[model samples]
Target chain A: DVAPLSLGLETAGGVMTALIKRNSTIPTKQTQIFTTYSDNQPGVLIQVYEGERAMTKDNNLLGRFELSGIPPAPRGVPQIEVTFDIDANGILNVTATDKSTGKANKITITNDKGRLSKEEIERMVQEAEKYKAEDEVQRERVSYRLPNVHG
Target chain B: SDVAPLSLGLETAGGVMTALIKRNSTIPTKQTQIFTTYSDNQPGVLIQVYEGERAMTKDNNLLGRFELSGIPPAPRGVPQIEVTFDIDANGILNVTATDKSTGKANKITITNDKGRLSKEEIERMVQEAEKYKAEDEVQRERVSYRLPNVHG
Candidate 1:
């Protein structure tokens, strides 16, 4: 009876990139590849978050860690992959790997986001509402731009 | 409020970010570390308080910074400067630096939202640190050994 959760992190431009989506069975993992935001960006501040908000700041920051010692390569050249693994009992572990340097850093993040119980019933309901609201907002925005093209 | 949400690093000479109170530690807690002069007759040391898990200050959030001066000139590493950081309830951080040789003291009080992490957030961080205690201890020791400690 674990709560349905969206496990992901924030990327450049304040966007919430979900490695795992709404209502997926756990005991699984998802990986996303990211390129350096700028040439010699110094380091990649991997700010992890969990929620449905399009804007990361609105979501709760699960934890944050940085990967330094990146070699001097132009932006979009370095391929860094991040893996979010959800194990039994809804435990979560995040790992960031620099493909070129072969450096992999893992963080075992534990949070109440995994708790399931009395009020958790409502928490799941609230989770669905957020998705519903976000969906309509995007639906209206798209219609206003592309026209009703349903001839 | 019961435990430190994140590790607080006190930047020593040479950017050696030393963990004053590590993540998941009990609070309102206080810890002290001894720092000393790097320049001949150096009478002051700059203090930069950071909050994060990064081993380098440049990679963490610099909560506050100040200069603690008015000490008798002494050779590098000769004079002892005891730096104490205390995070009381309300989550405010107070840093005090005292010259052990002359007994002069200066301080900086930061209103940095150490409470930025809410009850749940703080609890989550504490839980993470607890489960990672084994690996965490190894890294903490590596950082602790980066510099000299007179505890022996």
Candidate 2:
């Protein structure tokens, strides 16, 4: 099952509208909408990154996908929809569906071919499995503090 | 064993760079000072500078060398310029070169230049630092322990 993560430009502000949120079950799909930043700007360079930070530069730019030939209109008048899906293999797939034209552009990204090497995936999986077992038997110690103890 | 990581500058409000482990002050802004010739017929004077957090600017390297070419030499202490350092979100520092009397200002962004580490690497280093600090405290407690039967 290789659904794919979709990447798209954000609608408002600098935030990336992630199609597939983190830790979501695999084979997931998300849709992101982007709008024009200027009154009549023809195109925008949508920088894509993979990170938890809000700033794009602070995050790792996985790759960039662009949309051209947007209708001339005020900001927020037009929108571009980005759809992302993840398959059973945890692979991400994306599609940018233009609302006005109803045309969809699709792309697929794989982690097997050097993006995130197999060794990296295996290491993370091993770590996750180890933590899972540890979580079951870890002691449940409790510590308390005085409610008010300035004196 | 984890390696001792290099130090880097941190960002502050108003595009200022504050010292993390050294000094903490929002450098309001750096201004450049200029001086002219003290004598009527004196040629351009040599220029030098030193910069650092400490009061002794000589402790660090001087910024650079420059000659007031083209412009006529003036009386000493009559001209100067200002330079300001700012830190941005990426932790990179920036510098603004300004002339006080002329109100001339120019800006330059300074890259961190230090080795950039990935997120996972930074997290691992911090975890290791905390681990060592905790171990040191435990060893200190053992040294302070005394024998219970020493005194009645």
Candidate 3:
């Protein structure tokens, strides 16, 4: 199955830096590196989001964790790596590490506002199949209506 | 995180049988096995499902079950029933059984005490996830302050 939305981290100025674009297969992972927004920022809150929105706030918040233990440095000097892992069931696990210090924070997103319930997921699967079948019928109808295009 | 063992098997001889999906086996697991009827011409089979470690099926949590009917009449050993158990990343179990000859199938999903949201609820979530990100920034800031707790 495909991912329902894009997964990414919120960056400076509330922008969404997509790591895994929408429609990616399940049981996949993507990683992106970010930096502190302010100089000498001891820690950074890695806000994990899911959606197609350009702004982090508009997207669905999946989870968030703080990666601390950063040595005093200028903004964008320290590298913070964020990893998003989506399992077969679409459950998400996120990890944020301070590249310099090697310190890390991790979270398994079990329950969140963006999480789908079993029934909801099942329904979506059925709907996807139905949509595919219907789409094929519509394509046939369109082809029949526009025979000249086939030439 | 520890992976909990999900005790799986059929109910027979007044006890829950162990098919052996061991605890800590790993996540996103799958197990398949064949089952048969005890009596000749048995038209249906009841699959009792459970989710805890116990010698008896009754001792474990009754996670619910499904049954397949309309099997062709034949000797007990003549018909083959295939049961497949798939555990997804969220620790939910989906069990499907198919009758070899008739091709009749039935399935059950063990939610593990979780409630399901409606279609509109899910659609709303999807839409919200894809909504413009910046406009919600103020709300997010307000939320981040009221609660310092990070969700699991």
Candidate 4:
């Protein structure tokens, strides 16, 4: 089988990992265990994105899911574990499981942009074609080379 | 309608080719700038691209290569040639190289091989467009298709 080029998995609430750790072979997974920021925090919203960005907002939001209903422990007492796994296809699958309660959630992302849909790209291409048409008309009016060439 | 592609040009070693009009030009637009060699005993010189980097050729696939040779063999850098590229709507690139000393003009066209997207790819694009429209309609139904407060 062809070797995987690069693989990565991360979590959002708070994830710590290098950007683009390369030469990926197996299902590369990274786990980050962190505590709730505040005491008795009701729930947590994990907004995740994919990109080599130091800030969370700079990346593309592949998907986001929430983990809630903690046992109301102290700030550091409870922990959330985020695991990222890359299958053989080089696509990523993320799972967030609270070890304290074995509460786990895994999502298989399906990006069917090119295969399943095409209208948005077509609209963009059409818009590009319009500008392209505009460019063609401009070419006609602009003449190259000065008239007095052999003078 | 036949749309012309965008043409950016820069001068490179073999001669003056398309440098910055399209690719990573970093070239400020609508400015009349003259570039001349500083060396005195230099022979005729060619102006490669000036794309604000290590070399202009790295930014673009070569379209035209023209050389301005036969100089007075001055010191290190006296020969100067003027390079200009005018891009039309159809994306056709017209480049002119004028040797200041000899008063000779060399003009060529710059065509990027990578810019040529195939017909098959275009056909596939049409197919994708129709599908995206359907998805957008579905998304609009689920989420209120109303304008947001940001733009106003």
Per-residue lDDT tens digits for candidate 3, residues B93-144, read: 7788889887889999876322433546444543543463454445335533
| Model 3 per-residue lDDT tens digits across residues A1-151 | 7676667888766666776666555776555466786889999988888766555665678778888789999988887767777777767888887876789999888532256765764554455465656445543554244225555
Expressed as tens digits, the lDDT of each residue in B1-152 for candidate 2 is 01113222222222222222222221211212233444553443333322233222232224333433333455544545344443332344445444455665555454432334565755564455455656545543654453455575
**What is the DockQ score of candidate 2, to 2 decimals?**
0.02
Q: DockQ of every model listed? A: 0.01, 0.02, 0.02, 0.01
Give TM-scores for every candidate, taking all chains together and pairing residue i with residue i: 0.41, 0.34, 0.38, 0.32
lDDT of 1 by residue, B20-94 (tens): 887755455445678888789987888888876655566567878888888787777888988887665455678
**What lDDT is reached at residue A125 by model 4?**
40
Q: Candidate 2 lDDT, tens digit per residue, A26-139?
A: 554444455676897766555554533333333345655666777788977766666555566666666665578776555566643337655754564555455654433321
TM-score between model 1 and native: 0.41
| Model with the higher DockQ, candidate 3 or 4 | 3
Model 3 misses residue A144 by how many Å?
50
Which has the better DockQ: candidate 1, or candidate 2?
2
Superposed model 1: Cα runs more than 4 Å off = A1-3, A111-121, A124-151, B1-152
True-vs-predicted CA distance for residue B98, candidate 1, Å: 69
Candidate 2 vs candidate 3: the TM-score winner is: 3
Provide the lowest-lDDT 10-residue window in model 3 chain A: A138-147
Tell me the lDDT of model 3 at A6.
Answer: 66
> How far is A129's C-alpha from truth in model 2 (Å)?
21
